[PDB]
Design a protein around this ligand. Structure first.
Ligand code: 2BA
Ligand code: MG
Ligand code: MN
Ligand code: MN
Lengths: 91, 585, 191
C-alpha cells in the first residue's frame, strides 16, 4: 500500500533514508532549497522538487505547507523527517 | 558549443528574458472536442452550421511557422503555451499543429519525433481539436504509397490524437482523396475534403478554372462522405469579390460547411476573410498576430476587430488572444537565424502564384547556386513553365515540380522553343519525369501530349491511380527489419514513420542514440550551445532537473579534440569533443 | 488647402461619447466654414475600423460638399479593409505607399488597394505594373537603411487600447530602452 516515500530533510540522513527505501523497494522523493541546489541528496532520489522559493534555506526546510504540497503533488505516501529540522515538530 | 549548429552561422548566444506569460480570464464552455468525443462528427458538423459567428482555426502551430520560420518551431516552445491556448481560447474550432512539412523537417533538423510532439500536445490540450494537413495519396511525403500504408497512418494518427483530417490533392484529383476520406470516416474522425484554389474566377482570360469547375468539384466531393468542404488558397490568390462569389456559389451548391484557408501574401487576406464571412463561410484559418502577416495567415485579432461591428462576429476572446500573442512575440526572437527577412505585401504573387513555403525554398535553392541575382527571371520562368505545362495547380508536391523545372530551365540557359524542340535528348530532373509519368496523378484537362513525349523518352507512363501501381508493404517484415535495425521493439507509429522516411528515421535514431532527447532543451541552448560560466537547468523528466554549468573550454590538442570542463549536478565532468575546424593530427 | 480632422476614439462604441459622429460632423461644418478645398481625415494610429470608416465617410459626405481625403495607418492590420470601406462610402483620395515600404506601421500598399478594388463598383486610378516596377527599386534601396529599421513588424491590435502614433511609439520605445525601462514597456504602454 506504500510505494513512495518523501524525505523532509537534507544531507547525510536524506541519502541514508534513500538507500533504506531503495533496499525496501520504495520510490524516493527529495526536497531542496535554491541554496542547496548542489547537495548530493538532490540527485540521489528518483524525483526531486524545489521547496521554499524566495525564503531563508533553513526556513525553506521548515516550510510545512511547501513540503506537504510537494508530497501531495509527487504522489508520495510516507514522509520521513530524519533528524533535526521538523523531526521533533508536533505541528 | 565547439562546432555550431548545422546550417545557421556561428554566433554568440544572446541573453533572452523569460517569455511573457499570459493573463487569461478563463471562461469554461463546451468546445467542439467534447461534441466530437461524446456525440460524434455529425454532431460537430451540425454545431458548426448552427453557429451564427464565424469559427476560427488556429494555424499558429504548423502553418504560421511553416511560412515564416521554415517549420523550425520546436516542441519546447509550444509546451509553455499549449495549456494557455487550450484554456484561454475555447472558442477555436481546431488548432492546426501537425502534418505538412513539419513531419519531415522535425525528423531531419529538429531531431524530435513528431509523434512525441503530438502526444505532448494532446496531453497539454485536452479540449482542443487537432488538425493535420493530409495530402491525398501522399500523407507527409512526396511519393505515392499503397492504400494500406495510408490507412494504417490514418488509424495511428487518429489513435494518437488527430481529430480533423484536412485532405487535399496536388492536382485536385478525387481518386487520390477518396480512400483517405473513407479511412478517416471509418476511424471516426472529421474528414475535411479540400479544393485547391488556383487562378482567378472573375477573370475571363483564364477560363480553365471557372466557377462551374469548382461547383462540380464540390458536388462530387459532397458525393463522398466528407464532413466539411475546405478551400485552400496556398498562394493568396483569392480576391475578396472572388471570395464572396466562390463562397456564395459553393453554399448554394452543397450543404457541407466551408473552411477557408488563405495567405496574406498580397496583403488582402483580412478583407478576403471578411468577404467570405459575408458570403456565409463557416471556418477560417487565422494565426496569432506575432506570427501572422506576410507569408503566413491573417491575424485572428485583426479578423476579430474587422468583424466586431459587422452583422457577423468572430467567435474569439481577443484579450486572451493578445495575451497569447505576447508569448509568441517573445519566443519569435529565439528563431532569428531562421527568419526569411523583411516581409512586405507582394502583389507579384498574382502572376507566378508560388506557394509561400515553396517560394522561400526556391529562393534558398537559387541562392545555393550561382543564380541568386536572377530571381526576377526565375519568377518569369516559373510563370512561363506553369503556362506551358497547361495551367496546373501549384501546391506541394506539384509546385515543387514547377519550381525544379524552372530552376533547371534557367540554370542551363534554356528557352521555351529550345525545350519544346531541341530538348528531346536533354536530361531532366526526376521531379518533372515523375510528374509526367503519372506519379503525382492526372491533371485537369490532361497532359500536353507532345511535351510529355519529349520529357519522358521511353519510361513507363501510367494513366490511373498510382497507388495501385505500387509494391505492397507487409507490416510484419518491415516491423522485424526496423526491430533489428534499431535494437528494440517499435510501435505502429515508428513502423509507419520508417516506411515513409526510411533513411530519415534511421538518421533520427542515430542522433537519438548519440545525443539523446535534445527536444527538452530551450531554443537558445539548442541552437547556440552554451556560454562561459553559464548555468542552465534541463528537465529531462518530471522531478529530474539536470544542473549544467560550463566552467572552461580547453585548447585543441594535436589530435584535434577539445576538452570541456562541465559541472553536471554539482560535480566536475570533463567532456572530450573533436573540433572540426583544426583539421590536423 | 487641406483642412484635417484628427480621428480618435471609436464612433461605433457607446462607451466613449466624447468623440461621437456629431462632434466630427460639427468639426467638418466648422472647417467648411473656412475656405478649405479638401476635407482630410487623419487617422494617425490606425484606429478607423471599416464599419466606422463607412459610417464616418457617409455622414461626412452628406454633411459637407468638400472631397474627403482619408489617411490611416496599417498598425492594426485592417488598413486595406478600412480603405475599401471608405471607398464604398464615397471617399475621394486615400493615402497609400509602395509595397516595399507599406504594411506594419506605414500606410497600406497601393498595389494591395488596387487589387482589392479590381472587381468592385469603384476602381483605383493607378497603373499597377509601373507601381510594382517602382516597388522593385524601393525594395532594393530599403536594404541600405538596415541600422534604421525597427526590427520585425507585425500587425499589432494593441493600438486599439493605447492610441500612440507609430513614429511616437518607436520614439517612446527607444527612449524607454535608453533610460533602462525597456523591460516594462508593456507597463509603460498601460501607463
Ligand atoms: N453599407 C455598409 N455598411 C457597413 N459597412 C459597410 C458597408 N459597405 C462596406 N462596409 C464595410 O466596409 C468593408 C469593406 O467594404 P468592401 O465592399 O469594399 O469589400 C467587401 C466586398 O468587396 C465583398 N463583398 C461583400 N459583400 C459583397 C457582394 N454582395 N458582392 C461582392 N462583394 C461583396 O467583401 C468585402 C468585405 O466584406 P465586408 O462587408 O465584411 O467589409 C466591409 C464592411 O465592413
Ligand atoms: Mg456558422
Ligand atoms: Mn497554408
Ligand atoms: Mn501618417
Amino acid at each position: 500500500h506504500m510505494k513512495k516515500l518523501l524525505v523532509a530533510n537534507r544531507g547525510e540522513i536524506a541519502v541514508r533514508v534513500f538507500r533504506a527505501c531503495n533496499e525496501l523497494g520504495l520510490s524516493t522523493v527529495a526536497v531542496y532549497a535554491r541554496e542547496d541546489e548542489y547537495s548530493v541528496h538532490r540527485f540521489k532520489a528518483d524525483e526531486s522538487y524545489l521547496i521554499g522559493q524566495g525564503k531563508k534555506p533553513i526556513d525553506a526546510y521548515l516550510d510545512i505547507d511547501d513540503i506537504i504540497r510537494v508530497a501531495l503533488e509527487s504522489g508520495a505516501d510516507a514522509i520521513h523527517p530524519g533528524y533535526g529540522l521538523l523531526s521533533e515538530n508536533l505541528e | 558549443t565547439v562546432n555550431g549548429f548545422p546550417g545557421i552561422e556561428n554566433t554568440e548566444k544572446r541573453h533572452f528574458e523569460e517569455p511573457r506569460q499570459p493573463l487569461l480570464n478563463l471562461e469554461k464552455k463546451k468546445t467542439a472536442k467534447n461534441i466530437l468525443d461524446e456525440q460524434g462528427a455529425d454532431a460537430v458538423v451540425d454545431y458548426v452550421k448552427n453557429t451564427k459567428e464565424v469559427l476560427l482555426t488556429d494555424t499558429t502551430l504548423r502553418d504560421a511557422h511553416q511560412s515564416l520560420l521554415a517549420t523550425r518551431l520546436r516542441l519546447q516552445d509550444m509546451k509553455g503555451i499549449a495549456q494557455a491556448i487550450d484554456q484561454g481560447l475555447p472558442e477555436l474550432f481546431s488548432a492546426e499543429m501537425w502534418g505538412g512539412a513539419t513531419f519531415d523537417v522535425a525528423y531531419r533538423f529538429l531531431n524530435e519525433s513528431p509523434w512525441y510532439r503530438l502526444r505532448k500536445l494532446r496531453k497539454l490540450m485536452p479540449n482542443t481539436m487537432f488538425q493535420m494537413l493530409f495530402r491525398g495519396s501522399n500523407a507527409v511525403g512526396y511519393q505515392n504509397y499503397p492504400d494500406n500504408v495510408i490507412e494504417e497512418f490514418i488509424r495511428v494518427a487518429a489513435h494518437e490524437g488527430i481529430d480533423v483530417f484536412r485532405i487535399f490533392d496536388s492536382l485536385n484529383w478525387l481518386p487520390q482523396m477518396e480512400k483517405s476520406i473513407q479511412a478517416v470516416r471509418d476511424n471516426g474522425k472529421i474528414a475535411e475534403a479540400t479544393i485547391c484554389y488556383t487562378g482567378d474566377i472573375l477573370d475571363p482570360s483564364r477560363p480553365k478554372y471557372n466557377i462551374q469547375y469548382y461547383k462540380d468539384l464540390a458536388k462530387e466531393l459532397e458525393a463522398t462522405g466528407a464532413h466539411i468542404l475546405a478551400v485552400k488558397d496556398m498562394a493568396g490568390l483569392l480576391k475578396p469579390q472572388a471570395a464572396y462569389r466562390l463562397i456564395s456559389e459553393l453554399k448554394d451548391t452543397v450543404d457541407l460547411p466551408i473552411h477557408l484557408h488563405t495567405h496574406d501574401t498580397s496583403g488582402n487576406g483580412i478583407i478576403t476573410y471578411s468577404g467570405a464571412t459575408q458570403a456565409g463561410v463557416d471556418i477560417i484559418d487565422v494565426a496569432t498576430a506575432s506570427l501572422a502577416g506576410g507569408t503566413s495567415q491573417p491575424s485572428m485579432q485583426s479578423i476579430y476587430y474587422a468583424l466586431e461591428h459587422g452583422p457577423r462576429h468572430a467567435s474569439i476572446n481577443v484579450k486572451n488572444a493578445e495575451q497569447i500573442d505576447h508569448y509568441w512575440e517573445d519566443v519569435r526572437k529565439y528563431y532569428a537565424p531562421f527568419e526569411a527577412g523583411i516581409t512586405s505585401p507582394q502583389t507579384e504573387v498574382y502572376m507566378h502564384e508560388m506557394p509561400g513555403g515553396q517560394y522561400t525554398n526556391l529562393k534558398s535553392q537559387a541562392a545555393a547556386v550561382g543564380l541568386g541575382h536572377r530571381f526576377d527571371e526565375i519568377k518569369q520562368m516559373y510563370r512561363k513553365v506553369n503556362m506551358m505545362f497547361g495551367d496546373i495547380i501549384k501546391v506541394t508536391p506539384s509546385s515543387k515540380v514547377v519550381g525544379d523545372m524552372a530552376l533547371f530551365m534557367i540554370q542551363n540557359d534554356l528557352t521555351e522553343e529550345d525545350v519544346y524542340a531541341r530538348g528531346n535528348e536533354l536530361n531532366f530532373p526526376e521531379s518533372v519525369v515523375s510528374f509526367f509519368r503519372g506519379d503525382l496523378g492526372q491533371p485537369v484537362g490532361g497532359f500536353p501530349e507532345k511535351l510529355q513525349k519529349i520529357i519522358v523518352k521511353d519510361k513507363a507512363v501510367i494513366t490511373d491511380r498510382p497507388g495501385l501501381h505500387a509494391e505492397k508493404v507487409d507490416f510484419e517484415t518491415v516491423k522485424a527489419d526496423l526491430e533489428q535495425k534499431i535494437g528494440y521493439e517499435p510501435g505502429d507509429h515508428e513502423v509507419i514513420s520508417y516506411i515513409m522516411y526510411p533513411q530519415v528515421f534511421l538518421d533520427y535514431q542515430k542522433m537519438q542514440r548519440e545525443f539523446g532527447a535534445v527536444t527538452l532543451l530551450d531554443t537558445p541552448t539548442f541552437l547556440h550551445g552554451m556560454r562561459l560560466n553559464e548555468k542552465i537547468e534541463v528537465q529531462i523528466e518530471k522531478g529530474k532537473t539536470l544542473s549544467i554549468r560550463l566552467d572552461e573550454i580547453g585548447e585543441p590538442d594535436l589530435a584535434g579534440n577539445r576538452v570541456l570542463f562541465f559541472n553536471l549536478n554539482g560535480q566536475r565532468r570533463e567532456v572530450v569533443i573533436n573540433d572540426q575546424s583544426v583539421q590536423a593530427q
